[PDB]
Amino acid sequence: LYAIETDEVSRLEVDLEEAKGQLRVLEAAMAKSTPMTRTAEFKTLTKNVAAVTAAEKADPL
Amino acid sequence: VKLLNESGVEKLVEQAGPYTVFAPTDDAFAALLEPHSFNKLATLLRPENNDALRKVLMHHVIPGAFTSASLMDRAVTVKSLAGEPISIMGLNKLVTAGTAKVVRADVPCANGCIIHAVSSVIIPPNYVPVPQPTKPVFPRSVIAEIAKLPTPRQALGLDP
Amino acid sequence: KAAIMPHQIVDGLPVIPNSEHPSQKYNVPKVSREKLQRELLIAQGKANALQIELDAAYTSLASSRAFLAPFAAMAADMDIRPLYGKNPQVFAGQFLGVGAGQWGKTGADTVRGRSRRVAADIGVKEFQLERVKQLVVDLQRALALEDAEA
Amino acid sequence: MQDAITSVINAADVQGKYLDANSVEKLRGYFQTGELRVRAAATIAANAATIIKEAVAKSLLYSDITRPGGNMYTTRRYAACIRDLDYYLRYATYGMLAGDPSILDERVLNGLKETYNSLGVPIGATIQAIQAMKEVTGSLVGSDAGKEMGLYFDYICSGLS
Amino acid sequence: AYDMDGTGAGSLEPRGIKSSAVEKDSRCFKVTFVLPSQSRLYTFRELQNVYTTKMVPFSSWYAEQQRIQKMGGKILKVELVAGGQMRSVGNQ
Amino acid sequence: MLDAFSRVVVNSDAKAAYVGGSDLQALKSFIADGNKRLDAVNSIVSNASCMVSDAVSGMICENPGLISPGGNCYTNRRMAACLRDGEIILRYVSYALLAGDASVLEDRCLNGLKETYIALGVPTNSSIRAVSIMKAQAVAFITNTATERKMSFAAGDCTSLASEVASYFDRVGAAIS
Amino acid sequence: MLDAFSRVVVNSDAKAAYVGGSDLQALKSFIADGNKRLDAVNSIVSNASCMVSDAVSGMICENPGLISPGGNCYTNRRMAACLRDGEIILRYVSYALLAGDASVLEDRCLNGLKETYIALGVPTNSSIRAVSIMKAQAVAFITNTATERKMSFAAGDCTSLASEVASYFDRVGAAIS
Amino acid sequence: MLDAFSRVVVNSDAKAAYVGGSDLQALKSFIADGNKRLDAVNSIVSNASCMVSDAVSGMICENPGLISPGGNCYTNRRMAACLRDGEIILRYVSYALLAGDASVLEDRCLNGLKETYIALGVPTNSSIRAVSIMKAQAVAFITNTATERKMSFAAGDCTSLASEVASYFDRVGAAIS
Amino acid sequence: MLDAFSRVVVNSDAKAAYVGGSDLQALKSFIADGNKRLDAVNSIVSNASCMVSDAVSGMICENPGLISPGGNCYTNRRMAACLRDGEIILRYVSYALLAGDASVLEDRCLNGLKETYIALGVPTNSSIRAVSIMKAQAVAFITNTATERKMSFAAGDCTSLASEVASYFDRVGAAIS
Amino acid sequence: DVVNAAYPKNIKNKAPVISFDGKKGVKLEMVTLQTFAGDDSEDTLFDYSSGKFMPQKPADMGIAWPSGDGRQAEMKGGKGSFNQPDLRKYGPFPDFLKRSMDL
Ligand SMILES: C=CC1=C(C)[C@@H](Cc2[nH]c(/C=C3N=C(/C=C4/NC(=O)[C@H](C)[C@H]4CC)C(C)=C/3CCC(=O)O)c(CCC(=O)O)c2C)NC1=O
Ligand SMILES: C=CC1=C(C)[C@@H](Cc2[nH]c(/C=C3N=C(/C=C4\NC(=O)[C@H](C)[C@H]4CC)C(C)=C\3CCC(=O)O)c(CCC(=O)O)c2C)NC1=O
Ligand SMILES: C=CC1=C(C)[C@@H](Cc2[nH]c(/C=C3N=C(/C=C4\NC(=O)[C@H](C)[C@H]4CC)C(C)=C\3CCC(=O)O)c(CCC(=O)O)c2C)NC1=O
Ligand SMILES: C=CC1=C(C)[C@@H](Cc2[nH]c(/C=C3N=C(/C=C4\NC(=O)[C@H](C)[C@H]4CC)C(C)=C\3CCC(=O)O)c(CCC(=O)O)c2C)NC1=O
Ligand SMILES: C=CC1=C(C)[C@@H](Cc2[nH]c(/C=C3N=C(/C=C4\NC(=O)[C@H](C)[C@H]4CC)C(C)=C\3CCC(=O)O)c(CCC(=O)O)c2C)NC1=O
Ligand SMILES: C=CC1=C(C)[C@@H](Cc2[nH]c(/C=C3N=C(/C=C4\NC(=O)[C@H](C)[C@H]4CC)C(C)=C\3CCC(=O)O)c(CCC(=O)O)c2C)NC1=O
Ligand SMILES: C=CC1=C(C)[C@@H](Cc2[nH]c(/C=C3N=C(/C=C4\NC(=O)[C@H](C)[C@H]4CC)C(C)=C\3CCC(=O)O)c(CCC(=O)O)c2C)NC1=O
Ligand SMILES: C=CC1=C(C)[C@@H](Cc2[nH]c(/C=C3N=C(/C=C4\NC(=O)[C@H](C)[C@H]4CC)C(C)=C\3CCC(=O)O)c(CCC(=O)O)c2C)NC1=O
Ligand SMILES: C=CC1=C(C)[C@@H](Cc2[nH]c(/C=C3N=C(/C=C4\NC(=O)[C@H](C)[C@H]4CC)C(C)=C\3CCC(=O)O)c(CCC(=O)O)c2C)NC1=O
Ligand SMILES: C=CC1=C(C)[C@@H](Cc2[nH]c(/C=C3N=C(/C=C4\NC(=O)[C@H](C)[C@H]4CC)C(C)=C\3CCC(=O)O)c(CCC(=O)O)c2C)NC1=O
Ligand SMILES: C=CC1=C(C)[C@@H](Cc2[nH]c(/C=C3N=C(/C=C4\NC(=O)[C@H](C)[C@H]4CC)C(C)=C\3CCC(=O)O)c(CCC(=O)O)c2C)NC1=O
Ligand SMILES: C=CC1=C(C)[C@@H](Cc2[nH]c(/C=C3N=C(/C=C4\NC(=O)[C@H](C)[C@H]4CC)C(C)=C\3CCC(=O)O)c(CCC(=O)O)c2C)NC1=O
Ligand SMILES: CCC1=C(C)/C(=C/C2=NC(=C\c3[nH]c(/C=C4\NC(=O)[C@H](C)[C@H]4CC)c(C)c3CCC(=O)O)/C(CCC(=O)O)=C2C)NC1=O
Ligand SMILES: CCC1=C(C)/C(=C/C2=NC(=C\c3[nH]c(/C=C4\NC(=O)[C@H](C)[C@H]4CC)c(C)c3CCC(=O)O)/C(CCC(=O)O)=C2C)NC1=O
């Protein structure tokens, strides 16, 4: 009965379905583009940036 | 944040206690032009009625850190720092705070506090709107009021 | 029908040397009619917000007296006899009266207490309201001459 | 932690140049007021307890922060105030002698407004206490010395705001 | 007991850090700061990290915060993680 | 000016009606309680010098800025013209208590009083908490509950005269607000 | 809505009654006509549930191709969104009438609105008709010259408040043209 | 649907535990106040027909654009449907106060009601008013402080049941917002 | 009797001129087609606020860059000053229509205006665009060929006065060019 | 600039307001008819501040502290004689972060 917190593969597949369930409500809300105002809500830093990713890349114009 | 700074409530939510703020986006404040809600809230626009403004803003602060994940099909109430109970209501991933209908899930803050974006402004339950400023009226005569009081001989039915 | 504006009474009164707030009748700059209307409505708005924090000071004075009124009347029928100061047969030293500069600028500033301390808050808050209520008078009065000569 | 002489030497040193006429011009201006600052710091040391007793009784003695529920109710909380107001009157004395407010933000201002918000200390009543404390300090040291000591009080009030 | 017995100026124990902490206080901060030593170049001791973030109690935050600036430290952030605010009884 | 009986005539003149029989039932109970009204204005006029000195010097206890330099009760010409004005207000309140109707207070005293006090530089907020000390003094003298002076009356109940003179005193503070 | 004036704070522990350093001078001076302004916003938002249904159906009966199949208001998702955009515009006009400046109108409502409607295929020449009905509707309420609804007010004048709110409605209509 | 018993079942099913002695005290106290809850529903059902006419007409006298032509309370079918959904909402709240859990309120009453009121073109701002007038009546009937009908109840307290039905009407008003 | 109009005009201060019965028929005999001409200026000034709020807004409806940040019908004091200037030219046309000459319109209202609008940075092509709208309205109101309104007049022809009001509006645009 | 002497102090007086009040005379008035005004300027003619004032805080000098190291934000006074320039640059810094020249 406790094998949904203690298992090593039910822990992935539960957290896959909640993260896909959070993705499906976020992808549908990103079908609304032009007069939508922007709030930088400052999401967290649980996963660090693996790439360098400088803000100025080049002149691609 | 501007209403907090003017009203002096912002000192209260400066504190380190674990709070769960239900700060409404200004579209919620822009949505205060209901024909209905403008009755009970327009009177606060007057500059002397800061008194109720603290009591209406302090209903949005909840002692404790209630994240939306902590509201998995759970209905728990609590009173604000205003002093009156509010029912937080998370079912079908639709977390409610009175008449909130929360927009953004949570924002992690400094002292383990949480910030949820709501769609409207929660008015406290037993909040009566302040009346508009009126005219102190005085009775013009005194004989229209002695004639307005029933005599003892009237109360016993001795007279009409 | 028409109330007399308070700047038209100031023109009738003879001039005193000392005001609390001396007038800027001659010290208003020659600006246009539209900048006089903006500077009047700003000074009327600052006087409205200064009124409703002076009223919050009066409710704090009324709350400070109710805080101490069970003890203010409970010490009113005690026998409080001092050691000196009343009859001249006892050595009182500096408290024959008060000694050497310690009477103060007013006399009420040497009295301690919760209701005397919120009262000094009232007198500094009513000074700022009366200063800006006399500033809307000569802003209005120039308005009379902005229009009367117009 | 720099005085007027330390700040003058730093700016003249940070460009690698000697003390020219402009750098010594301010230094002479500081030495002229050297006699005023010591006597100002003299009387403030004498009437330290009297000044703080005058400020709290004139600003926040009887307000409802003093009553129950207010921010200053319990005796530990009241005693923390006069301990707390002592630093403002003391560190302002240091700025008045050093002629430079660098010591204030170095040792007072940093983490101060962020600390009062943690404790829930009312910044509004705090500044008015310092303003009232600035008002009595101009009584003792005189006008211009009060202008000097007063110049660092509102520096605390500005940053603490 | 607590640090406010009556000690002030002119008292037998030396004039020192006086904290407004109650009997056995249970409030503690979460502070963050850098504190360069400014003494290693004539002592030549080993080096230790100066950027620390730790929980200091309310009983001794003021002494620590008063000392962190003594040696030129800068306090980046402090919070009251454990304890209440405006709480008359219960800080014990 | 009007009194209590001229007030009921100008209501009856508005409909061109005679003062009949049903509205004489209330006028006969006004004159039946007319001896309590004369017994009430006698408890104000007898105490009237100490009423405006308990009030003006109690206004100073809540505002030390009046007796600071530049203040409104500062110099001797200015304290004398405030002790003058405090007993003019007590004079016209006792006229309307005697006349039964507040018409002599509203046009001979309270009309134009606010913008009079702007022009001289009088603080109108200090006048409101000065005439509210006299309001509490008068209702202690009507109902014989002052602590330092008791007067000798017959037995009964004068609470309706207490809240009629209380309404003449918050009619003053509505005019200088 | 509650940013559109200035409250004053009087209690302690506020850090705006003492250290705040400013009364809002441009917003203390807007309660100087503020009883006239609050009645004017009360005329609109007590009729805004009738104003948006009259204006949207005004352009349907003046242009019947919008409820044609293939028209932009045929489906029930589109008919609900056209009623929602009229109310949201009418609220932000009622912000700018209340606040006295059109900064809040051109920031939240009008910024990026012409680029929205030509991306969605919304006809702009018919949409300005629906705003200009509400321009003609709102001046009838504020001057109280509406036909089938009058409202009780205090006696006076309300021109240059109907003329102020006519200056916001074309400002909407030129930003979307 | 669920109730106050089966809410702590499916909460104890999530932890895969038995309903032990630490959770029966949430239920044995609920049944010990079972007579108070049945006396609390009976204040609502006995005034259920006059509360809905009290509340929909109070929506009309605050928002008079609903009875104007082009509104949403205009015709007799539209008025009787607005008297229907005032009491259909009141039917499910009185189930949800009786059951002790808001599952019946969030699966039958609120089962896409926001999607209905958009697609019907019902103004959602006025239906927040019509729900919340019934909230302000139900906390006056349960606490027996209605101003014009007192029911005879045994003395005690109902601040818990008044605050429970105030959280069911806000949960309706949160979801149709 | 025409001097008593101009004595109110040229006296460099404020006045009025109430015209009575026996003075009226001397004016109607003096003014040629006076019963048409007194209907001609009545068809303008009874629709004065409707004609301004088209003509200021129709300038913005064709030139939308004026209410852009940086335009001149931004910053609401400037937007209200354009509407007062549009109201002044509409009035001073109608006095020239009443008096039958463009002389009083030229010296009081129109001389020095070309130097005024280039001293304030007023875009002078849009002011000709604004008065061409008011030129288009006043020929329609006089001829009773207005669109949403029609006026109840005595029947006849007023094309000669409609050409006469065409000759006043272009003199404005010939001056501010 | 006030070039408006051509528009004198009888400026916006608005003579042609005409009210017929029936079939009778035209009743021409002289009403000025002001706008929805507001006259927007900053720094008006008086103070309008009665106490409650300590708002002033110095500018942020980056990560050092405010107003501490302004030795890079100064004019200059001296330079010296035997100073000789540098080869690498490593261009100019935010004030050598926290310690001053008198550390
Ligand atoms: C049976 C014969 C007979 C007449 C000839 C008239 C004579 C007459 N006409 C008018 C009606 C009038 N209406 C006008 C108006 C006019 N507008 C214009 O553009 C034209 C120039 C002019 C028409 C010629 C004039 C000038 C008079 C005459 C002056 C007058 O008495 O008012 C009036 C005034 C009362 C009224 O309006 O009826 C009288 C007594 N009446 C009669 O009963
Ligand atoms: C809390 C909400 C709130 C409101 C709704 C208003 C309500 C309101 N309006 C006015 C008072 C007034 N209101 C109006 C407005 C109007 N009169 C008309 O004939 C026009 C049609 C209409 C403008 C659209 C006028 C002209 C006055 C008189 C005072 C004045 O002109 O400043 C007053 C003062 C009453 C008095 O002292 O006489 C109040 C309380 N104020 C508030 O605080
Ligand atoms: C030192 C500071 C100082 C004060 C704070 C006041 C004290 C004071 N006294 C009264 C109140 C009063 N003052 C009087 C006056 C008198 N009593 C008598 O018996 C005499 C005949 C007469 C003086 C000649 C009376 C009758 C009351 C009413 C209280 C009572 O005794 O019942 C009030 C009114 C309360 C209110 O605001 O509503 C106040 C504030 N006076 C001061 O001096
Ligand atoms: C020339 C001056 C002059 C006066 C001063 C009064 C004097 C006066 N007072 C009362 C008589 C009275 N006075 C009062 C009044 C009061 N009693 C109280 O307990 C209250 C403290 C106070 C209310 C104000 C009462 C209750 C009576 C007796 C009942 C009554 O007369 O109606 C009476 C008796 C009338 C009667 O009994 O028929 C008289 C003559 N009349 C005058 O002609
Ligand atoms: C804060 C300001 C603010 C606004 C002004 C509106 C603006 C706006 N309208 C629409 C979206 C829309 N707006 C309309 C409205 C209309 N089309 C017409 O033909 C009529 C002329 C007009 C009604 C009067 C329609 C029909 C859609 C839906 C378009 C579609 O889905 O095809 C959208 C896209 C997202 C949505 O579906 O809502 C936005 C952002 N929303 C806002 O948040
Ligand atoms: C062919 C279809 C058609 C319609 C649906 C209506 C809709 C409609 N009404 C008005 C015009 C108006 N509409 C209103 C609105 C209202 N009046 C009230 O009493 C209510 C409170 C509220 C409607 C619920 C007002 C006040 C006016 C101004 C004219 C008037 O006073 O009636 C206009 C603008 C007309 C103009 O500006 O000249 C339109 C298109 N008219 C039509 O021609
Ligand atoms: C499951 C729960 C449940 C409800 C809550 C109700 C609510 C409800 N009302 C209507 C239908 C309606 N509902 C309203 C109601 C209102 N319009 C207003 O202006 C007011 C704000 C509000 C009344 C208070 C009106 C006016 C209609 C008529 C629409 C029509 O006839 O097409 C409909 C569509 C039904 C139909 O027309 O076929 C529904 C589902 N019925 C339910 O089964
Ligand atoms: C302008 C129009 C208008 C109305 C029609 C009434 C309607 C109305 N009544 C109440 C408030 C209430 N309404 C009722 C309803 C009723 N009383 C009963 O005993 C019956 C069951 C039922 C009438 C048949 C009750 C019980 C209260 C609580 C207070 C009380 O009456 O004791 C409220 C909520 C409080 C408020 O916002 O005012 C409203 C809007 N009020 C208005 O402002
Ligand atoms: C079949 C239908 C049915 C009912 C209608 C109720 C009837 C009911 N109510 C109560 C009993 C009660 N009801 C209340 C409730 C209240 N009292 C107040 O003063 C408040 C206004 C109100 C709160 C909502 C209280 C306080 C008691 C007594 C204490 C208790 O039972 O817990 C009791 C127990 C005491 C008794 O025997 O009367 C019963 C049977 N039960 C039922 O089975
Ligand atoms: C009796 C005769 C009479 C007139 C003819 C007008 C002429 C006039 N216009 C303005 C003043 C103005 N006039 C305009 C007008 C416009 N700018 C535009 O973009 C539009 C094209 C146009 C309106 C449709 C503006 C915007 C100002 C104000 C300039 C400013 O404040 O920046 C001023 C004030 C100048 C000053 O104070 O120095 C005057 C006298 N007024 C009069 O009293
Ligand atoms: C007081 C009531 C009243 C009105 C509302 C107007 C209505 C009106 N507008 C115009 C005529 C016009 N009206 C406008 C105004 C506008 N057009 C637009 O593009 C926008 C929709 C709107 C600005 C918001 C314009 C631009 C013209 C045409 C002017 C021209 O010829 O260029 C005409 C002239 C037609 C004719 O004479 O036959 C009339 C009667 N007139 C009145 O007497
Ligand atoms: C007291 C103030 C006063 C006025 C407001 C006017 C109004 C007016 N005009 C005419 C009479 C008239 N009015 C007009 C005018 C017009 N007819 C049209 O077809 C055009 C649309 C419109 C031109 C704008 C004409 C053509 C006549 C008839 C000829 C004339 O009398 O001049 C009449 C007489 C009608 C009758 O005999 O019953 C009156 C009262 N005259 C006044 O004395
Ligand atoms: C709950 C614990 C607690 C205490 C004890 C407390 C005391 C306290 N005593 C005060 C004043 C005062 N206290 C006294 C007391 C005395 N005078 C004497 O002669 C006696 C020896 C003694 C009383 C028995 C006096 C005279 C003042 C006013 C001093 C002044 O006005 O300067 C004040 C300032 C005014 C006020 O806000 O009340 C406080 C806060 N606060 C607290 O929270
Ligand atoms: C040298 C620079 C410096 C300052 C300024 C400083 C302040 C400081 N003030 C404190 C508390 C406090 N400060 C106050 C002060 C006040 N209450 C009021 O109402 C007034 C507005 C105000 C007096 C002016 C109170 C009441 C506490 C106790 C708070 C508590 O027990 O929760 C504390 C908590 C620990 C302690 O006091 O022992 C610190 C560290 N520390 C420093 O290093």
Curated annotation (Swiss-Prot), chains F, G, H, I:
Membrane topology qualifier: Peripheral membrane protein
Claim: Electron transport is one of the keywords in the record: yes
Predominant cellular place of this UniProt entry's protein: plastid
GO CC terms of this entry: chloroplast thylakoid membrane; phycobilisome
Alphabetized SUPFAM superfamilies for the sequence: Globin-like (SSF46458)
Binding site for (2R,3E)-phycoerythrobilin 1: C82
Keywords: Antenna complex, Bile pigment, Chloroplast, Chromophore, Electron transport, Membrane, Methylation, Photosynthesis, Phycobilisome, Plastid, Thylakoid, Transport
Residues the entry annotates as binding (2R,3E)-phycoerythrobilin 2: C158
Post-translational modification: Contains two covalently linked phycoerythrobilin chromophores and one covalently linked phycourobilin chromophore.
Matches recorded under InterPro entries: Globin-like_sf, Phycobilisome_asu/bsu, Phycobilisome_asu/bsu_sf
Keyword Flavoprotein attached: no
Residues annotated to bind phycourobilin: C50, C61
Summary of subunit composition and partner proteins: Heteromer of 6 alpha, 6 beta and one gamma chain.
Family: Belongs to the phycobiliprotein family.
Function recorded in the entry: Light-harvesting photosynthetic bile pigment-protein from the phycobiliprotein complex.
Protein name (database record): B-phycoerythrin beta chain
UniProt organism field: Porphyridium purpureum
Organism ancestry: Eukaryota, Rhodophyta, Bangiophyceae, Porphyridiales, Porphyridiaceae
